[model samples]
Target chain A: ANIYKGKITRIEPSLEAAFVDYGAERHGFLPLKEIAREYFPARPNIKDVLREGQEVIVQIDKEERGNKGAALTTFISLAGS
Target chain B: ANIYKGKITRIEPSLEAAFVDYGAERHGFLPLKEIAREYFPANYSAHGRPNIKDVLREGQEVIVQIDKEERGNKGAALTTFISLAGS
Candidate 1:
């Protein structure tokens, strides 16, 4: 449930994911599953939804991968008071 | 008009709008009317005007929106830009 808000810095179709610059020590990841509805139609073409230099809001689902980055998401909701 | 930039991670309010990673093949959104000029007045808490890390250059029109995240801001007058450059 660890969420972060950042921007889209890079995209890697080969790896089937994207990297988000969360102002942290390193960048983050946003898997295909986490992509928006618009991008769903074209799974590999996530770039259609976002490109380099775009701002985004993501969620950290998993910790950073080996020399990789943190798993992220855009589907979020603040719960609990 | 086909604008894209890197961004931070995670931000959701129920299901109104969320998901903007831009990396790792997923995540992207910045609804609430391209959140600028005070992240909009009470539309949806945009975590206080971009709190996930950022940058910029010159003659750029900062654009922000939901689903498609690629926003920037071009302040009035280059004086401010000069001051930043000098410092």
Candidate 2:
């Protein structure tokens, strides 16, 4: 129905993702691929873009249930972001 | 940076929030205040605030655009404004 504003609480490289606090009970997932589009000559690394205690604004991708939690992406939708 | 796809994982009435899974890894937090404006006529009292327990359900579908990056053990923040891509 809308967008939310939270913070990037942690980072997970192995799974190639991070954790976010969008205001839900549990933390949301921010995968490496979800990172903002900043193509470079060489490959890209989430660690290079984000930190463990970094802060970012993400949109509501979907509402997971049962065994999974909420997912995330860097493609922020700021109406015109 | 872009839009994402996920689902409602769980609901926390006491906390007035719900857990969403967008595909990052953990679960994103969805508070009642974040609920879209629609039930304005039916509910809206001190206990009226958009309660996750009332609306929405587990395994519910959602489309996230982009916003805050979660940290600590909390879920990434979400919004209702909603956007697709591009400027």
Candidate lDDT (C-alpha), each: 0.47, 0.64
In CAPRI terms, model 1 is classed as: incorrect
Tens digits of per-residue lDDT, candidate 1, B2-78, equal 22332434444443333343332544554423344422223444464433222221222222223323345311111
| TM-score (chain B) of candidate 2 | 0.71
TM-score of chain A of each: 0.72, 0.73
Q: Give the Å error, residue B53, model 1.
A: 35
Query: Which residue segments of model 1 deviate by more than 4 Å?
Result: A38-44, B1-87
Q: lDDT per residue, candidate 2, A1-81, as tens digits?
A: 344554667877788787887778788888888776531122656566665555555666877777666887666553211
lDDT of 2 at A31: 87
Q: What number of clashing residue pairs does each candidate have, in the order they appear?
A: 48, 75
Instruction: Name the docking class for model 2.
Output: incorrect
The lDDT of model 1 is 0.47
Q: Which segments of model 2 are wrong by more than 4 Å?
A: A1-81, B38-47, B84-87
Highest lDDT: give the candidate number: 2
* Model 1 TM-score (B-chain only): 0.20
